[PDB]
Design a protein around this ligand. Structure first.
Ligand code: CLA
Ligand code: CLA
Ligand code: CLA
Ligand code: CLA
Ligand code: CLA
Ligand code: CLA
Ligand code: CLA
Ligand code: CLA
Ligand code: CLA
Ligand code: LUT
Lengths: 214, 39, 219, 203, 229
């Protein structure tokens, strides 16, 4: 069949290859129930898209900071620097705004998961077709896909779905690496990459001092 | 996963989860608001 | 059909009906029909706007060589700027919604609303807008879209050359002609693993904020 | 039937009945003897070759520092001064690469022929095995096409040299513990003065 | 193939002597698929020809200019004295990269389109009368074969065998230059002078190339092909 995560091992039987990024990986059989599997598919998509946006917003400012053009703080310090620089914007007001905005959009996504296409009735400002949804985790329409890259052809949509899920998983793993590298070095990730590029046989996890506490 | 969630729905597992939640809630209330005698 | 990559294959959704169609759509941005029509209108208006802009910047560099086109709004012939913005917004709003409802309802915006326009193609007005045609329709359409795409590329070059040099386009061309080996972007910008040389942007940070466009990602 | 079959199984471990599941099955035990044998031949050659070449001046490193147990494998017994990479980063690389090799080999054992199906940069052509886990063969593992008619004799020679190498590696360990010198240093002391340098004098 | 790379071995079923220089040699089975085999044939052809030009250019550079290391030929002071324009005429290496980058982007994209679809870019884009014949893949001909030297198979075999020799020799050139610090003909002279006292056993442990060099303001890091000291 398709390529699997562990060659020579049969894929998990509840995974049939229809979902994007199906390499048959479910050794704990967490997706045995199909409805729970759809829920976990939406979980994976939300996690991967959030990870991709966050990894972009860490990497590109850190690359620009490393060049010396700007002085954007590292990702683990940015909240502190923002609060120190914004005394007329309290933390709780920002948190309240974020919670109500994400609550609105996430409750709309949740209610579409419970009842697919039920946000298409025109209750939110007359929007009907753009909130119907194409598939589970893939809204589409003229608002979420204004360039129409999902409505061109089927194979193009499957290609872009594969690109999305693989880059999302890579960005999730990269954010895990960001956390681990900051805990081990106390620096940013582009600082880590530059230190490794300057002297790679000396700049390794084995010489940061915490991965090997000997 | 269905059989596993059915096991997690057995009476002692539900009792463990619910009482862990209730005891943790009481403990954290008394940590954040120490020594409440009166309203 | 002549293709952007000869010996290659054009995408299926680009049949060749539109002028200047060479089967260039690797992202599939025009694979929807209504999106293809809207993007055709957008490419037309972008082409004409950049065409006028490239001509105007070249003339301003030729005619007034003491004025940087980037800072040409400082030297424009103090609260009267708000009224001119109002006049521009009103006139642009009127003509743009006329064009937009020509797109949405073809032929509905084909009559003078004060005292008429012939039946035409969407995005190709004709009538009083086309008094003289020294050529054929498809040929001049191909010339219009080709010159327009060249002008769009040229305006992107004008902007980024103004950022990296602080000078006008023909001055930059003269600097390239003086020293062709030490004036290219390859000559001044180098990134290798472990060391990056990023040229500075001579345009100030603010005057009104005036940021250099993605200067932190320059090579 | 089996190569190098002397009938020596005093603990009846290769008995087939009842030993169906697990690692005490006959197939796993013959396979494990072969794997131990080949690793032991690499080790028995490799734990004394740097010492021999350093004593003879072929390599410039001193014979004391290229002794197998002082070169970095047991840092309490010594560390070699400045490889191109530190030993723990080398061990990280070793874990990744050797896990790739060993897990692919294991998947050939549990599922014979399965490592020739999925794409592996075209390498899956030569990784189908033969149905015999100890002897995969093919265009790489037997790239010189040896053993056209004496494959059983070559299997016997491989197992005999492997058992000798296994005993030699055990001797390397025992002599390292007893004498704290290299195996070639031990051989040259036994050669130079046989009565005055042996296990009775080292005890 | 027919004469194989070793006695007793067998050729793979996909290597039966169709291509030139078929010795039945594929221990890793990389050319088992026809598309991959065709791609690696194109890669081997261009690798062999670049190594041919490289070996013939390194060897001729030592005859004309023995005092300039071919390894150190990239430094600006090791260039020939020619006028690159500007206020002084000194090189920049930015435009030197730029010319080659544009020209090779054009010619290699033309070759790549030829590889993807056979006989698809045979026709001259500007002056449409010109046409390249291209009998097989990697052999365009026409302007590329003016003297018409294409037994095609025998001279193909000569090309691929001399090319494989050139690649092996270029690896020898690079490793010898890194280990000794001298060009290949100086290595030949040194081996001829003191054979037993100057060979690979006296030079393999040293990397004579410096760990970094500075090229007009940018510092390129350098490394040998093995951990020499
Ligand atoms: C998951 C997405 C995500 C999150 C949570 C953040 C979070 C943050 N970013 Mg980052 N960013 C992202 C994606 C993200 N970014 C991407 C994809 C890029 C490219 C950037 C490029 C970027 C830069 C260059 C900077 C930040 C900064 C910040 C901080 C201030 C945000 C702010 O002031 O709002 C701005 C709010 C507005 C402009 C108004 C909202 C607009 C509506 C329509 C009104 C905050 C910690 C700043 C920082 O590090 O410290 C202050 C900073 O300089 N971001
Ligand atoms: C690798 C990145 C990537 C890719 C290939 C896709 C692919 C897809 N997305 Mg997804 N997405 C992403 C990242 C991505 N997404 C991120 C970060 C978010 C959160 C903001 C989303 C949120 C999202 C929604 C809400 C929807 C999609 C939809 C789609 C589909 C159509 C749109 C498209 O083809 O974009 C193609 C992507 C590219 C050509 C790559 C663009 C890379 C940019 C230019 C880099 C920008 C960097 C900058 C700093 C930020 C397609 C399956 C729609 C749907 O699923 O269809 C039915 C839909 O409704 N996406
Ligand atoms: C299920 C019961 C329960 C509830 C309602 C809470 C609630 C809370 N915990 Mg608590 N916690 C619990 C069980 C619970 N905890 C258990 C079983 C442990 C391990 C012993 C913890 C260990 C823990 C830590 C270490 C912290 C919290 C913190 C918090 C607060 C923010 C999250 C919140 C008041 C955080 C805090 O105190 O406020 C920021 C914090 O740092 N919790
Ligand atoms: C019927 C018996 C009884 C009663 C009426 C009380 C009453 C009280 N106890 Mg005692 N207690 C009891 C039995 C009892 N306890 C037993 C059997 C033990 C041994 C396990 C204790 C050990 C104990 C300790 C060690 C403490 C108390 C404390 C308290 C106070 C908790 C107030 C609170 O958490 O508000 C919070 C309000 C809520 C949680 C309401 C729920 C609101 C939801 C979230 C809405 C309250 C006065 C604490 C106090 O400080 O004493 C004055 C304290 O530290 N209790
Ligand atoms: C896209 C169209 C466009 C826009 C937005 C501008 C914008 C501008 N121009 Mg050009 N320009 C254009 C096209 C354009 N120009 C064309 C097609 C020509 C040739 C006819 C010119 C020839 C031109 C000259 C010769 C000059 C300008 C100048 C100006 C500035 C003041 C104009 C004024 O005061 O007019 C009021 C009526 C303003 C920044 C003037 C200047 O201050 O900046 C260089 C100036 O001297 N323009
Ligand atoms: C040099 C670039 C160029 C070229 C070759 C064309 C060519 C064309 N135009 Mg555009 N156009 C341009 C730039 C150009 N235009 C610019 C800068 C604007 C904004 C001022 C326009 C705005 C425009 C409108 C509003 C109309 C045209 C029309 C036409 C067509 C007939 C008129 C004609 O023959 O013009 C010859 C031009 C030159 C000799 C110069 C023809 C396809 C008409 C149409 O689309 O179909 C009849 C029409 O109604 N054009
Ligand atoms: C009370 C402890 C105990 C007892 C009586 C047994 C008994 C048995 N085991 Mg179990 N086992 C145990 C603990 C035990 N095991 C533990 C702690 C583990 C996890 C580490 C295992 C994991 C295990 C596996 C994976 C296998 C057995 C097998 C066996 C059988 C043969 C063992 C043998 O030949 O020894 C001789 C011992 C060796 C040859 C190796 C000794 C090396 C270690 C480091 C000492 C026998 C029924 C085998 C069997 O079931 O198949 C027939 C088999 O494959 N055991
Ligand atoms: C299980 C087998 C085994 C293991 C774990 C070791 C381990 C070790 N050996 Mg032995 N050794 C062995 C078997 C082994 N040896 C055998 C069988 C012999 C007899 C031939 C030797 C003879 C020997 C000598 C003479 C020396 C060692 C040394 C060492 C040490 C350094 C290793 C090193 O630097 O790697 C180097 C890594 C490589 C050689 C492989 C790198 C390959 C790169 C990544 C890719 C190359 C690709 C490229 C295209 C190749 C083209 C080359 C061309 C010619 C084809 C280390 C303790 C040295 C020493 O004792 O410690 C200081 C030393 O001087 N070993
Ligand atoms: C399995 C064989 C083996 C291994 C793993 C090593 C390992 C090593 N040797 Mg070594 N060597 C060997 C066989 C080996 N040698 C043989 C047979 C000779 C004689 C031809 C040498 C001659 C030699 C010299 C002269 C030097 C080394 C050095 C080194 C070290 C640096 C790497 C290097 O210079 O590569 C050399 C690559 C080869 C020899 C390819 C074969 C490294 C630990 C250097 C050292 O001692 O400290 C840095 C050094 O100066 N070797
Ligand atoms: C058969 C019989 C039958 C019955 O029934 C029962 C009984 C009796 C039980 C049996 C008996 C038996 C035998 C005796 C067993 C033992 C063995 C051997 C010793 C093993 C090894 C085994 C051994 C082997 C693995 C090995 C290998 C080695 C290694 C590679 C090494 C390596 C090295 C190198 C080189 C060098 C460096 O520097 C370091 C190191 C890293 C260190």
């Amino acid at each position: 069949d398709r390529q699997v995560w562990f060659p020579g091992n049969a894929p998990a039987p509840h995974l049939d290859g229809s979902l994007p990024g199906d390499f048959g990986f479910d050794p704990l059989s967490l997706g045995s129930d199909p409805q729970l599997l759809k829920w976990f598919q939406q979980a994976e998509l939300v996690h991967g898209r959030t990870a991709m946006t966050a990894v972009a917003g860490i990497l590109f400012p850190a690359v620009a900071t490393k060049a010396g053009v700007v002085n954007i703080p590292q990702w683990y310090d940015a909240g502190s620097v923002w609060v120190q620089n914004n005394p007329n914007f309290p933390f709780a007001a920002l948190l309240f705004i974020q919670i109500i905005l994400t609550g609105w959009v996430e409750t709309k996504r949740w209610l579409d998961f419970k009842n697919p296409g039920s946000q298409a009735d025109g209750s939110f400002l007359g929007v009907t077709d753009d909130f119907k949804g194409v598939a589970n985790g893939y809204p589409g329409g003229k608002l979420f896909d204004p360039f129409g890259l999902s409505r061109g052809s089927e194979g193009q949509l499957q290609k872009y779905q594969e690109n999305e899920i693989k880059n999302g998983r890579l960005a999730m793993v990269a954010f895990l690496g960001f956390i681990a590298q900051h805990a081990a070095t106390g620096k940013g990730p582009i600082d880590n990459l530059a230190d490794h590029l300057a002297n790679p046989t000396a700049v390794t996890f084995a010489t940061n001092g915490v991965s090997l506490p000997f | 996963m269905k059989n596993f969630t059915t096991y997690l729905s057995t009476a002692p597992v539900v009792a463990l989860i619910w009482f862990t939640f209730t005891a943790g809630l009481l403990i954290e209330i008394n940590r954040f608001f120490p020594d409440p005698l009166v309203f | 059909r002549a293709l952007w990559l000869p010996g290659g294959d054009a995408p299926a959704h680009l049949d060749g009906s539109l002028p200047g169609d060479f089967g260039f759509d690797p992202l599939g941005l025009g694979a929807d029909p209504e999106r293809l029509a809207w993007f055709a209108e957008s490419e037309r208006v972008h082409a004409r706007w950049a065409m006028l802009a490239v001509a105007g910047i070249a003339v301003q560099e030729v005619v007034r060589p003491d004025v940087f086109w980037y800072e040409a709004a400082l030297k424009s012939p103090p609260a009267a700027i708000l009224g001119l913005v109002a006049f521009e917004l009103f006139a642009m709003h009127f003509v743009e919604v006329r064009r937009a409802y020509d797109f949405k309802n073809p032929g509905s915006q084909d009559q003078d609303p004060i005292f008429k326009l012939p039946k035409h193609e969407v995005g190709y007005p004709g009538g009083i807008f086309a008094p003289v045609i020294p050529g054929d329709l498809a040929e001049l359409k191909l010339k219009e879209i080709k010159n327009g795409r060249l002008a769009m590329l040229a305006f992107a070059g004008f902007v980024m050359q103004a950022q990296v040099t602080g000078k006008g386009p023909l001055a930059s061309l003269g600097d390239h002609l003086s020293n062709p080996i030490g004036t290219t972007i390859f000559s001044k910008a180098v990134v290798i693993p472990g060391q990056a040389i990023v040229p500075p942007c001579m345009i100030p940070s603010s005057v009104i904020p005036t940021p250099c466009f993605l200067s932190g990602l320059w090579p | 039937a089996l190569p190098a079959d002397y009938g020596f199984d005093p603990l009846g471990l290769l008995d087939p009945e009842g030993k169906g599941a697990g690692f005490v099955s006959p197939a796993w035990l013959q396979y494990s003897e072969v794997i131990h044998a080949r690793w032991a031949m690499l080790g028995a050659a490799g734990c004394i070759a740097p010492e021999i070449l350093a004593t003879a001046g072929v390599i410039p490193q001193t014979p004391d520092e290229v002794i197998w147990f002082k070169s970095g494998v047991i840092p309490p017994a010594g560390v070699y001064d400045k490889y191109w990479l530190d030993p723990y980063s080398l061990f990280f690389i070793e874990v990744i690469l050797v896990q790739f090799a060993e897990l692919r080999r294991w998947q050939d054992f549990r599922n014979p022929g399965s490592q020739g199906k999925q794409y592996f940069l075209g390498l899956e052509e030569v990784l189908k095995g033969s149905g015999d886990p100890s002897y995969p063969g093919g265009q790489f593992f037997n790239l010189f096409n040896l053993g056209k008619s004496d494959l059983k004799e070559l299997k016997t020679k491989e197992l005999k040299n492997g058992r000798l190498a296994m005993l030699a590696v055990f001797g390397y360990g025992a002599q390292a513990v007893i004498t704290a010198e290299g195996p070639f240093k031990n051989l040259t002391d036994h050669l130079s003065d046989p009565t005055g340098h042996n296990i009775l004098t080292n005890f | 193939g027919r004469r194989l790379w070793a006695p007793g071995v067998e050729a793979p079923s996909y290597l039966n002597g169709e291509l030139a220089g078929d010795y039945g040699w594929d221990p890793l089975g990389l050319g088992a698929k026809p598309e991959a085999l065709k791609w690696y044939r194109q890669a081997e052809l261009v690798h062999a020809r670049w190594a041919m030009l490289a070996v013939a250019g390194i060897l001729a550079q030592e005859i004309v200019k023995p005092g300039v290391f071919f390894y150190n030929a990239g430094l600006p002071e090791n260039l020939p004295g020619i006028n690159f324009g500007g206020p002084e005429g000194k090189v920049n290496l930015g435009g030197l990269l730029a010319w080659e980058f544009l020209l090779f982007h054009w010619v290699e994209v033309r070759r790549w389109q030829d590889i993807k679809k056979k006989d698809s870019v045979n026709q001259d884009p500007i002056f449409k009368g010109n046409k390249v014949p291209n009998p097989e893949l990697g052999y365009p001909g026409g302007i590329f074969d003016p003297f018409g030297f294409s037994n095609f198979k025998e001279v193909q075999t000569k090309e691929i065998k001399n090319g494989r020799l050139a690649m092996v020799a270029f690896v020898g050139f690079i490793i010898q230059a890194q280990a000794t610090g001298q060009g290949p003909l100086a290595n030949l002279g040194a081996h001829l002078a003191n054979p037993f006292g100057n060979n690979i056993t006296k030079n393999i442990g040293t990397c004579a190339i410096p760990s970094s060099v500075d090229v007009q303001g940018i510092t390129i890091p350098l490394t040998c092909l093995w951990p020499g000291h």
